[PDB]
């Protein structure tokens, strides 16, 4: 019964724990507090999804780098523009598109938290934007039995 916001946040937390010094950006701490985060980043569902997204990232490493750098350098309103991209992808859905979006969001969070020169507000509004935009998948995921069912049986 976990929401997309919870699983994406847990994935971003897990990704940070296995990258850099393992410390969490204050933004991810906040999101976990404000989002009633019930899902552990070490949960098997999170670990299993993390591999799928990492595989998507590596297979499309350059495209993810290009798309993100084009996104973050041309935006004047980070969090709102995350919604715009989300709506364009899901014109209206498939498992591949869900995972493609989630991997792109995890990659963005990784890049933002790994570069110590990124301003706080850029990290803050990006994480908020991707988590709030991702809420649009709850309806579809619910009809597929939840994120746990998709990975454990599909």
């Amino acid at each position: 019964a976990y929401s997309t916001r919870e699983i994406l946040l847990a994935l971003c937390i897990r990704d940070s724990r296995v990258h850099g010094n393992g410390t969490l950006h204050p933004v991810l701490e906040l999101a976990a507090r404000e989002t009633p985060l019930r899902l552990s980043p070490e949960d098997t569902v999170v670990l299993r999804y993390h591999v799928l997204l990492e595989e998507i990232i590596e297979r499309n490493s350059e495209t993810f780098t290009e798309t993100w750098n084009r996104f973050i350098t041309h935006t004047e309103h980070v969090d709102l523009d995350f919604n715009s991209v989300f709506l364009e992808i899901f014109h209206r859905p498939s498992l591949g598109r869900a995972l493609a979006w989630m991997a792109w969001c995890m990659h963005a969070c990784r890049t933002l938290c790994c570069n110590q020169s990124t301003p706080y507000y850029v990290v803050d509004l990006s994480v908020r934007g991707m988590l709030e935009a991702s809420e649009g998948l709850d309806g579809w995921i619910h009809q597929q039995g939840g994120w746990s069912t998709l990975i454990e049986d599909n």
Binding site: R70, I89, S94, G96
Partner: peptide
Amino acid sequence: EQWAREIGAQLRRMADDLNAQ
């Protein structure tokens, strides 16, 4: 703008690629 549309196009594409598996 253009940037948001190009991103959406690429991610839809890569998605269809993973659906092919």
